Amino acid sequence: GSSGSSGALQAGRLGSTVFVANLDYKVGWKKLKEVFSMAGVVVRADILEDKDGKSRGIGTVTFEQSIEAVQAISMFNGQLLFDRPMHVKMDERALPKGDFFPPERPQQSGPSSG
Structure with a gap:
């Protein structure tokens, strides 16, 4: 079997979620969230285990x-x-975010007919 063809890239750095690393064990989802509360409201706060x-x-x-x-x-x-x-x-x-629509505008004109 082939080694394992892979492929990926980063085209579109969007979103809000943030990845936090190098945190103190004592630091819990509570403190972390409470702290981030500064920048704004934390919709979802949790720690990775x-x-x-x-x-x-x-x-x-x-x-x-x-x-x-x-x-x-x-x-x-x-x-x-x-x-x-x-x-x-x-x-x-x-x-x-399920938010996107195609460019559709009511425009018709072209009086041409032999």
């Missing part, structure tokens, strides 16, 4: 509007929390 169960210093925060999300990422980008720098980067999976 591994097989063992203990958080690997990685969390996830979801704001309401992109604007708010961005602010946090920055205001938190390189922020020293509990004597430990946090890593807030824009999420990868940019899920849509």
Whole structure:
């Protein structure tokens, strides 16, 4: 069987979700969320765990509007929390919002007929 042909790329950095890494064990979804509350309202706040169960210093925060999300990422980008720098980067999976329509406008004109 073939090795394993793969393919991917990053074309469209959209969304609000933010990936947080290098967090303190003590830091819980509570504090994390409460903190991110600054940039804006956290629609969904939770922490990422591994097989063992203990958080690997990685969390996830979801704001309401992109604007708010961005602010946090920055205001938190390189922020020293509990004597430990946090890593807030824009999420990868940019899920849509069921909002998109094709360009359809009522325009008809062309008086030409032999």
